[PDB]
């Protein structure tokens with residue numbers, strides 16, 4: 001089974017092709033600290049059998065947070081907690097990765113279960129266009145503000161490596177900051193950072209290159225993207241192919257192919273594996289390795305898309321929230337001897 | 349659905365009828381201390397939705413351990429650990445229970461995944477018959493040793509309450525000490541503690557009375573029994589009914605109905621629900637509350653044995669090792685809304 005054949009990326013080898021997708025837990029302290037919630041939540045899935053865990057979106061500056069309880073990585077005082085987190089993940093069998101994030105014009109909303117309303121922070125973005133009815137109007141970054149954010153990703157990456165994380169993902173998807181620079185739905189700038197495809201890719205590619213610089217080649221660098229925003233006149237799969245080419249030229253290791261999030265009022269044809277065609281096109285047409293994500297819930301489904309050459313890595317989100325030992329069941333269903341803790345062998 | 353209706357036990361409410369059955373982890377320190385393993389293993393199932401967790405067999409004296417790495421409760425220094433386990437379990441949503449134990453003539457074996465061989469301890473028993481070939485001949489207890497063992501159970505019961513457990517279960521099943529006193533297969537005593545059914549019940553019922561005395565009446569005392577030994581001439585269902593009657597008279601609140609274990613070479617008719625008939629017989633003929641356990645893996649199975657009045661409580665073992673969030677899924681299966689952690693809401 002390809003699902004449980006090791007994968008080479010950078011200079012490391014994942015034990016299998018299943019990854020835990022980044023998933024915001026809104027359970028950090030107001031200072032962005034790791035809490036007991038993360039220390040239970042993540043190593044459970046590591047024991048569960050994924051080769052890699054990508055820790056949820058972690059804000060590279062305070063105003064880059066989604067909620068006031070996001071993980072943050074903007075301070076060296078985040079190190080002890082992040083270190084302990086990576087350590088407990090590796091102890092339970094998985095490679096610890098982390099997604100570095102900046103929430104752009106969508107910064108500052110309550111936790112989903114606290115209503116999730118905007119908190120009205122002073123949020124930044126490409127253009128002064130609110131995300132939707134009732135969001136604050138983003139402040140448009142100038143070149144100085146972009147350099148400061150770019151430097152926060154760089155130090156965030158340095159900090160993640162020092163914490164012992166081995167895979168870094170840059171969040172350039174879902175209408176957060178770097179996503180919103182790519183899409184012409186959110187980015188209507190008339191300077192050298194909007195209009196043309198190159199102008200819109202500029203800042204995101206600068207971040208990728210600046211982070212590639214401080215992440216040694218043996219350590220894989222992912223970039224997650226919305227391969228389409230699903231809007232008319234929006235960012236399309238073809239734009240994604242152009243972007244992947246540039247990323248591949250910068251030495252980026254894998255493109256984690258998501259979609260949507262840039263604006264709210266589009267129709268998104270949800271179905272199992274609906275974003276798989278995006279991982280498949282990039283992979284086959286650009287030669288950049290891809291991660292597939294979106295309604296992947298079945299071992300046979302994961303296997304099949306790998307057998308098809310659609311992706312190199314299968315990322316799982318919601319199924320690992322409800323079924324955190326999924327990957328041990330998966331192995332068994334694909335005729336593979338699952339990696340069970342000896343304490344649990346009588347159960348499998 | 350009855351599976352998800354509260355169960356009232358004296359002063360105590362279990363929010364549902366699912367309980368995690370006791371399952372030795374063999375992952376304590378040599379001194380019987382709770383470790384990081386228990387702190388991860390147990391709260392996981394608690395978040396998984398179960399109303400009661402019974403912590404694995406916890407030896408009341410060192411010689412009463414199965415392995416060198418069982419939990420123990422023979423010392424005041426066991427309390428910080430035990431107290432933190434219960435606390436984490438409670439915090440994740442379950443009532444914390446604990447199984448108090450003495451391995452008796454099956455005491456002192458290596459961890460299963462290290463060959464499970466006898467270790468040469470001075471194990472005790474009602475009579476000098478070794479468990480099986482390879483196994484030591486136990487020392488028959490005298491009146492001094494029975495009284496010491498009794499007081500260990502009482503003080504273990506007191507310590508457990510101090511650590512914040514609310515359900516106490518006395519392990520009198522599976523060929524361990526109290527169970528071996530019941531069965532004439534292993535109890536061939538010729539004093540007031542062997543021979544007749546009255547004599548064999550004698551030490552076990554002393555232990556129960558004595559523990560009953562120190563557990564506040566608002567808190568449930570459980571006893572687990574092998575309802576048969578599957579052995580010719582052995583302890584039968586009939587015997588269990590007699591014993592059950594006596595326990596009910598004592599103020600025992602529930603019989604947790606297991607079977608077998610007394611000797612190695614017996615034919616046990618394994619099947620889904622195979623021990624359900626014993627929980628059913630005791631409940632309906634004795635009027636004593638029961639817990640069903642044994643190859644229960646399905647929500648519809650769990651609901652049904654309850655609808656039939658077969659048991660009051662459903663205990664899950666192995667299915668919770670490989671599927672820790674079974675109870676959340678069992679809810680949706682039975683048309684009830686899962687009690688999901690809000691971090692997990694979008695996954696359900």
Ligand SMILES: Cc1cc2nc3c(=O)[nH]c(=O)nc-3n(C[C@H](O)[C@H](O)[C@H](O)COP(=O)(O)O)c2cc1C
Nearest residue numbers: 021022023024056057293294295296316317318694
């Ligand atoms: C509660 C929740 C939190 C999420 N947090 C993030 C985030 O941290 N970063 C990100 O790129 N995607 C995030 N996502 C998207 C998932 O990582 C995943 O791409 C998406 O849910 C589709 O995959 P799935 O169907 O397996 O869940 C989140 C989704 C959910 C359900």
Ligand SMILES: Cc1cc2nc3c(=O)[nH]c(=O)nc-3n(C[C@H](O)[C@H](O)[C@H](O)COP(=O)(O)O)c2cc1C
Nearest residue numbers: 346369370371372404405641642643644664665666
């Ligand atoms: C690894 C393991 C450890 C167990 N430890 C105990 C023990 O602590 N005390 C006990 O009474 N039963 C113990 N059991 C038996 C279970 O608690 C349960 O009664 C039995 O496995 C049948 O239930 P199940 O089919 O749901 O697993 C253990 C079983 C296993 C698999």
Ligand SMILES: O=Cc1ccc(O)cc1
Nearest residue numbers: 024057066112171173174
């Ligand atoms: O919690 C929802 C969420 C979705 C996508 C993200 O990138 C981050 C958060």
Ligand SMILES: O=Cc1ccc(O)cc1
Nearest residue numbers: 371372405414519521522
């Ligand atoms: O480890 C297996 C085990 C089974 C039943 C018990 O009662 C105790 C331990």
